[PDB]
């Protein structure tokens, strides 16, 4: 609640910071961060109710003034303050923070990880193409659907190099030639497309990794949705 200006002079001699007009939602957050319970009555105030905090410094700005409750023993709550001059600078960064925190959280929850930069798409497209000829346990007409599915995954590495201006056909031959030499060498070598240089790269050394749950439902989800578009026999329009 508010504080009269008469008490501000008394609070200034003791070097005590005074605050007023706080949001009700932020008041309950301080109970978890600091640990001290809310005191409803001064007559019931006890020295064990007060908590402990770290370095508290007030930034000096003419428009606003901030108070840092930070540096606590067991706060268990973080905060991300996005700074920007314009409107789009705050909105563009906000989307990267929301998607950035969830991608890291999926690594802790789901212990499985997958390399990015087209490592899974190129390896799966080449594997399903050569495995269909060795198995031959589905049908002859099924080869059309398997071959089309393998060529449909190659658009991702071709799109990444399309915006960069590099030749998508030149970068594809370098990847296929490396997978053939690594297969007969009897070892495990991950291959990926390097966008900056334009040649291949090792996704383990370059540090490009994606979550397992992201790409698991991506191939399965896009398969059923794209199939339903072909399952449409006729497009009907009523009331127009």
């Amino acid at each position: 609640k508010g504080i009269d200006p008469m008490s501000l002079d008394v609070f200034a001699k003791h070097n005590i910071l005074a605050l007023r007009r706080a949001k009700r939602r932020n008041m309950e957050r301080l109970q978890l961060v600091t640990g001290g319970e809310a005191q409803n009555s001064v007559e019931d105030l006890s020295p064990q109710i007060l908590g402990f905090s770290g370095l508290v410094y007030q930034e000096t700005i003419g428009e606003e003034k901030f108070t840092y409750v930070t540096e606590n023993t067991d706060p268990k709550s973080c905060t991300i303050l996005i700074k920007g001059s314009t409107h789009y600078a705050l909105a563009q960064t906000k989307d990267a923070v929301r998607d950035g925190l969830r991608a890291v959280a999926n690594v802790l929850k789901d212990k499985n990880i997958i390399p990015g930069a087209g490592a899974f798409y190129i390896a799966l497209s080449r594997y399903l193409r050569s495995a269909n000829m060795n198995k031959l346990g589905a049908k002859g007409k099924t080869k059309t659907g398997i071959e089309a599915f393998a060529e449909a995954l190659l658009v991702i590495p071709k799109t990444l190099v399309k915006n960069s201006g590099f030749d998508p056909l030149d970068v594809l031959a370098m990847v296929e030639d490396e997978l053939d030499d690594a297969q007969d060498s009897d070892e495990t070598r991950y291959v990926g497309v390097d966008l900056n240089i334009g040649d291949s790269c090792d996704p383990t050394i370059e540090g490009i990794w994606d979550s397992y749950r992201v790409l698991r439902n991506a191939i399965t989800g896009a398969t059923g949705i794209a199939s339903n578009l072909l399952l449409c026999d006729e497009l009907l329009r009523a009331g127009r």
């Binding site: 001059s85 314009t86 409107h87 789009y88 915006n163 960069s164 201006g165």
Partner: protein, 71 residues
């Protein structure tokens, strides 16, 4: 720019960048408009040549760090 209504999205970028010059300083209102306007004019030769705008942005980022360090 305050008395005129800004609509086109490419124009809003220079107007919002102009308000960024109003704060923290009182000079450079005509500097940010002429400099950023010429960078798009000289980039026309790169677009017609066939160079993608992605590497054009990356080229200015490398030249910006070299320029600010020399100042």
């Amino acid at each position: 720019l305050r008395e005129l209504d800004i609509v086109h999205p490419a124009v809003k970028v220079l107007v919002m960048a102009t308000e960024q010059q109003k704060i923290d300083m009182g000079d450079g209102t005509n500097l940010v408009m002429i400099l950023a306007g010429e960078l798009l004019n000289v980039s026309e030769k790169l677009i017609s040549m066939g160079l993608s705008a992605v590497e054009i942005i990356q080229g200015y980022n490398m030249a910006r760090k070299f320029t600010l360090k020399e100042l």
